[PDB]
């Protein structure tokens, strides 16, 4: 097992990661900015180095200050968790040749998987179900790209292949908006990514998010450990996840699983990842893969039994995966809400002080965040305060656990979407299950 890890991360994934090596055995080194010398994880830590100053930019995006700090310290393994630099190729690189194990895929792998373009071609080549699409970058003629939408049919989506989830993308209705559209998605990724490639996908009018959980070893072994479903979100950001997805038969599970397994043999994936796909009309379209740990990984482990968390530094250790595809059962239903530090009425980050904090306890209840009394959320980071997660044998078990788990939950001092949360629980549609993409602003305006 690793000897000693920097947690390259903050607040509620980096105190997930700490509990993580303490049950390993393994030594944790704490590297936060000046801003996060009070977090949860950073006071529990073995070993804390300050990075930089408040700014990401300066601090958690600092690679050369978190390799010293990982030098320093003597680790051996350095975690990104998610955000970040979890999916920087470069990064990942620099931790290899520095000597260190970096605890996710190898740098290629990222960089394949990181250009979208390059992602659904691998997929395309592996017999992963991916949306009709242009099938490489789009050109300056304006004949092949109208064209190119005549072959897929509109509606048609353009969008960045260095962005992603929302970013730099629009729909695109008949020809007469392509010509301005393409122009435009051009620029925006030339903008903040640096790179002007585009690409067509058909639009899928009304999809649910759902995706599959992946480990692999460095090894040709590779597992899946079933999906989850996504799809309540507000401005492409996730608020609700739920695992496993209502309506997924175990057929489909078992036919996607396998597709997605067979795609990491194929990529040589190493340590965990998801495979997003839309999902409509009983069909899978691959959208992007996320190669690293996701915010709502406690879902798939309360219904797997898997500690994913300690299967990737188990991966990263150099163990071969230790469990077989027939050994992983899904079990009962798990859901988790977001907690965010967030104004109800206006969705501006409510950072400050909290005054009053008390958090949700009882069976199948699963609280995950670093908050305390007395705690200061700084302006200068994600919204995303605490992850609750409830499990019960059965979905509406799990449900009726989350309603009475968000109303025990007291955050004062600072505005929280725990009210909307529970607005969402008690949705009649949210509780039938299987609501779309588009869910929750329609039920909001
Ligand atoms: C993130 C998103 C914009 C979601 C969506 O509506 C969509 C879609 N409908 N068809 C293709 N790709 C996408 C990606
Ligand atoms: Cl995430």
């Not at 629009?170 to 585009?198: C, H, P, W, Y």
């Not at 309603?403 to 001092?413: F, P, V, W, Y």
């Amino acid at each position: 097992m690793l000897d000693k890890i920097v947690i390259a991360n903050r607040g509620e994934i980096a105190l997930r990661i700490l509990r993580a090596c303490k049950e390993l055995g393994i030594k944790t080194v704490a590297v936060h900015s000046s801003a996060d010398r009070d977090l949860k994880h950073v006071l529990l830590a073995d070993e804390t180095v300050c990075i930089g100053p408040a700014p990401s930019v300066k601090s958690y995006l600092n690679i050369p200050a978190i390799i010293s700090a990982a030098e320093i310290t003597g680790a051996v393994a350095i975690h990104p968790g998610y955000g970040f630099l979890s999916e920087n190729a470069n990064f990942a690189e620099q931790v290899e040749r520095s000597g260190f194990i970096f605890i996710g895929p190898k740098a290629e792998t990222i960089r394949l998987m990181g250009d979208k373009v390059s992602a659904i071609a691998a997929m395309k080549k592996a017999g992963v179900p991916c949306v009709p699409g242009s099938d490489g970058p789009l050109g300056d003629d304006m004949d092949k790209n109208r064209a190119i939408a005549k072959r897929i049919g509109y509606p048609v989506i353009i969008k960045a292949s260095g962005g992603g989830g929302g970013r730099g993308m629009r729909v695109v209705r008949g020809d007469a908006e392509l010509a301005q559209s393409i122009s435009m998605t051009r620029a925006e990724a030339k903008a903040a990514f640096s790179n002007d490639m585009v690409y067509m996908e058909k639009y899928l009018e009304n999809p649910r998010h759902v995706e599959i959980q992946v480990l692999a070893d460095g090894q040709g072994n590779a597992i899946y450990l079933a999906e989850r479903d996504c799809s309540m979100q507000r401005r492409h950001q996730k608020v609700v996840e739920e695992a496993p997805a209502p309506g997924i038969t175990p057929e489909l599970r078992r036919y996607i699983g396998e597709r997605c397994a067979k795609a990491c043999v194929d990529i040589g994936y190493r340590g965990a990842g998801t495979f997003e796909f839309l999902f409509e009309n009983g069909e899978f379209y691959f959208i992007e893969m996320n190669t690293r740990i996701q915010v709502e990984h406690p879902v798939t482990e309360m219904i797997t039994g898997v500690d994913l968390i300690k299967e990737q530094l188990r991966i990263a250790a150099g163990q071969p995966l230790s469990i077989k595809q027939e050994e992983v059962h899904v079990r009962g239903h798990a859901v988790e809400c977001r907690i965010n530090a967030e104004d109800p009425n206006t969705f501006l980050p409510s950072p400050g002080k909290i005054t009053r904090f008390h958090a949700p306890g009882g069976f199948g209840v699963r609280w995950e965040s670093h908050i305390y009394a007395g705690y200061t959320v700084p302006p200068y980071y994600d919204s995303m305060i605490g992850k609750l997660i409830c499990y019960g044998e059965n979905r509406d078990v799990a449900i009726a656990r989350m309603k009475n788990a968000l109303q025990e939950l007291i955050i004062d001092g600072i505005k929280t979407n725990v009210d909307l949360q529970i607005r969402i629980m008690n949705d009649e549609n949210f509780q039938h299950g299987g609501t779309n993409i588009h869910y929750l602003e329609k039920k909001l305006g």
